[PDB]
Design a protein around this ligand. Sequence first.
Ligand SMILES: NC(=O)C1=CN([C@@H]2O[C@H](COP(=O)(O)OP(=O)(O)OC[C@H]3O[C@@H](n4cnc5c(N)ncnc54)[C@H](OP(=O)(O)O)[C@@H]3O)[C@@H](O)[C@H]2O)C=CC1
Ligand SMILES: NC(=O)C1=CN([C@@H]2O[C@H](COP(=O)(O)OP(=O)(O)OC[C@H]3O[C@@H](n4cnc5c(N)ncnc54)[C@H](OP(=O)(O)O)[C@@H]3O)[C@@H](O)[C@H]2O)C=CC1
Ligand SMILES: Cc1[nH]c2ncccc2c1[C@@H]1CCN(C(=O)C2(c3ccccn3)CC2)C1
Ligand SMILES: Cc1[nH]c2ncccc2c1[C@@H]1CCN(C(=O)C2(c3ccccn3)CC2)C1
Lengths: 264, 264
Amino acid sequence: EFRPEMLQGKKVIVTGASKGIGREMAYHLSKMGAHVVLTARSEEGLQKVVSRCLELGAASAHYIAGTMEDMTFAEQFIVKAGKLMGGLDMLILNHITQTSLSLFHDDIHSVRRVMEVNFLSYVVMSTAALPMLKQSNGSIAVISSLAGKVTYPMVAPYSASKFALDGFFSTIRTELYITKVNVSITLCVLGLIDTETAMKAVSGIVNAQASPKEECALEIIKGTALRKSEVYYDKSPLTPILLGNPGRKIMEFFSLRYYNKDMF
Amino acid sequence: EFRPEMLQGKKVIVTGASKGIGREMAYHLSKMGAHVVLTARSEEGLQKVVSRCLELGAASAHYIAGTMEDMTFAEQFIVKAGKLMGGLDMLILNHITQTSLSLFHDDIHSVRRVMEVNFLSYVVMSTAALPMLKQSNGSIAVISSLAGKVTYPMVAPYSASKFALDGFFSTIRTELYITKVNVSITLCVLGLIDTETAMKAVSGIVNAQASPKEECALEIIKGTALRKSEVYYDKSPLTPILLGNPGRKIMEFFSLRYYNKDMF
Ligand SMILES: NC(=O)C1=CN([C@@H]2O[C@H](COP(=O)(O)OP(=O)(O)OC[C@H]3O[C@@H](n4cnc5c(N)ncnc54)[C@H](OP(=O)(O)O)[C@@H]3O)[C@@H](O)[C@H]2O)C=CC1
Ligand SMILES: NC(=O)C1=CN([C@@H]2O[C@H](COP(=O)(O)OP(=O)(O)OC[C@H]3O[C@@H](n4cnc5c(N)ncnc54)[C@H](OP(=O)(O)O)[C@@H]3O)[C@@H](O)[C@H]2O)C=CC1
Ligand SMILES: Cc1[nH]c2ncccc2c1[C@@H]1CCN(C(=O)C2(c3ccccn3)CC2)C1
Ligand SMILES: Cc1[nH]c2ncccc2c1[C@@H]1CCN(C(=O)C2(c3ccccn3)CC2)C1
């Protein structure tokens, strides 16, 4: 079971922390006495949150600002964040590029930039951060969506980038497990959350019930601290079960016999 | 019930058709007596296969050479192809980048390479081809892997692009359907296929039984022609069931009742 002391004095990165879900995780982490380094495009939005974080009890709080469409920034940012803290216990990949609802029509340029920001910068940052994480037996939080397990109309690009997250990190997850690297990867599948940017976007298009961003943030943290493979945070009770996919678990367990053990 | 007569004289595009599964689908379509345009990087390799296709009885056979790493080629190929045949009934997106089995150690450049060719190019051509496919109510086939539904080690970049296909094209399908477009989208979930490449590539790493390439090809063509959401071909029979994932289906279904039709 979870104890906030588990994050006390621990080094934690959070991308997308200037608002929404990722700001809330900044506060919760700050109240648990972790060291945090935060980042986003908005330099002023990052300032206010670090300032709140310090009032909230954070051992230390630093921002670095930029855009995660730039892979150079994505990687160098991890390196500065590990130098400011002297290590890295937890990498939480949360930011996403400006998304809207709409039927797909001819966006090669939209699809790419989405893929880079919502997928590429995650892979960039995971691998840059993995040496420091391997040293601490740390954990990654990869924040995804029901739309990373099932599909909804009007969100083809975004949805491509979340599916890609499962495919990729799930594979990293097993590989780590089989080569005995004690780093955990939590895929955090979430339903509608009442962040300001989600509601504005669904307005007049989707009429679902949203869940609170504060508690959402909480389950993400606790799930990753507890080295869980997946977190499901959604309003409906019949979500983790209809999304269970017991076949995928069965296939993944047996597929290993296909492999030469020496490879591992 | 599938009738090969169905494809006599139809206009088909096949990618990665200079060898492997791609080459088989061209042969088959040719015996059915269809028009084909083939593409891939190999100039002379493409030539042997067109010469062969014409020998088998293809209505027509042409090729356009190039790399699908370049989106400009990807769009413009579909345009030249369309002209060459005067239209399009079936687009087969099949090509993939050089792919090796190994624990993940790629740098971002390589991973972008994987996602551009394996994924981004697929989105590009289906977008470009869509107008003719509407013109003819044709079909799209997206060649995926079991690795696009569940995870296997040593294949995370590949598995990502594959997962990114299910997410994107499943969305497009739903969107085409709620808007009454008569273009169908067939995701083909393949198991190990005894193509030269994969066999020598799994050599010493994976000991599974392969499915025959000639049949695989036909099962692709049959499904896309019958307009199936998904095709499953793999030596094990208990596979399509386990990968059934009825919950996702049940869930994608009720999901529309939370939308406003004014967007239809
Ligand atoms: N709320 C919901 O309904 C659901 C949310 N999720 C996932 O939860 C996570 C966070 O959601 P949420 O808090 O609502 O999102 P928000 O839109 O509220 O904010 C996310 C963060 O991303 C940052 N950001 C935006 N663009 C860039 C960029 N180009 N480079 C770097 N940072 C950027 C934002 O800061 P800034 O603009 O200043 O750069 C912001 O701090 C995302 O991964 C989302 O996909 C998943 C399912 C449902
Ligand atoms: N074989 C198997 O066991 C399985 C295969 N699949 C899927 O089946 C499909 C076909 O695979 P397979 O026939 O076995 O592999 P092959 O290597 O035999 O064929 C791949 C084709 O893609 C072409 N190609 C490679 N790179 C590019 C590029 N950058 N631009 C354009 N064309 C390119 C190749 O030609 P050239 O190099 O000259 O460009 C070749 O014709 C793939 O999508 C794969 O994921 C899925 C599950 C299992
Ligand atoms: C577009 C967009 N921009 C955003 N900026 C910030 C946060 C969320 C979003 C979003 C969508 C809105 C909700 N999102 C979902 O993934 C869920 C969903 C999708 C489609 C239909 C029903 N639900 C809730 C699962 C993410
Ligand atoms: C490496 C490599 N190069 C290739 N060049 C051309 C075609 C396929 C491949 C491939 C692998 C071989 C098998 N592939 C799979 O996607 C499946 C799988 C993966 C892992 C373990 C058991 N099965 C069959 C599903 C793709």
